[PDB]
Amino acid sequence: VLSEGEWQLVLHVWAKVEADVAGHGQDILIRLFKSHPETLEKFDRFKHLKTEAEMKASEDLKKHGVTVLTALGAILKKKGHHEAELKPLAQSHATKHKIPIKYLEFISEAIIHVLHSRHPGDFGADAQGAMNKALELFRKDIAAKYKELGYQG
Ligand code: HEM
Numbered sequence: 784v785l786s787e788g789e790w791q792l793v794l795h796v797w798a799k800v801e802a803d804v805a806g807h808g809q810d811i812l813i814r815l816f817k818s819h820p821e822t823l824e825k826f827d828r829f830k831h832l833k834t835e836a837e838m839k840a841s842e843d844l845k846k847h848g849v850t851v852l853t854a855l856g857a858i859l860k861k862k863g864h865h866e867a868e869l870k871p872l873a874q875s876h877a878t879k880h881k882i883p884i885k886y887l888e889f890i891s892e893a894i895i896h897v898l899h900s901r902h903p904g905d906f907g908a909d910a911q912g913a914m915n916k917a918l919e920l921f922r923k924d925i926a927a928k929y930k931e932l933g934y935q936g
Pocket of ligand 1: 825828851852854855872880890
């Protein structure tokens with residue numbers, strides 16, 4: 784469980800994410816796609832994009848980056864009590880999108896990278912630690928839904 788201390792750190796950097804969701808959402812998906820190319824193959828919708836410059840020029844990709852960060856933001860502000868929000872999310876990812884839990888680990892890593900680039904003084908070791916925990920709790924609750932459905936672990 785995150786402490787109320789750790790959540791404060793989490794929601795304090797998230798409030799600045801919210802200052803430019805689109806921006807952050809674009810950087811995050813691009814990092815994920817470049818670092819883990821197989822992840823791009825899960826999107827029929829963005830599969831055509833070949834270069835970083837193309838990804839950057841895609842307004843539709845920018846639009847999906849807000850969709851994603853918007854769903855994450857709502858979960859995070861629930862501080863742990865996110866079951867209604869998480870559920871539909873795990874359902875669609877396991878069963879429609881077929882996204883392995885491992886791929887959820889790579890986007891976490893992408894998020895924590897971008898946050899670090901964008902908000903140094905706001906994302907020290909301590910907040911990095913808190914965000915990592917929040918995303919592990921995310922991963923863990925989603926995993927328990929996947930196993931219940933007969934996907935991944
Ligand atoms: C922070 C983790 C993530 C969050 C909060 C998130 C959120 C969303 C949401 C809200 C949607 C639209 C509604 C729905 O279908 O659920 C969506 C669509 C989707 N997500 Fe995620 N997602 C996450 C991670 C991933 C990852 C890692 C992948 C693949 C590598 C993935 C693949 C997709 C695909 C294929 C769609 C369908 C989009 C479309 O074609 O319109 N998601 N995601």
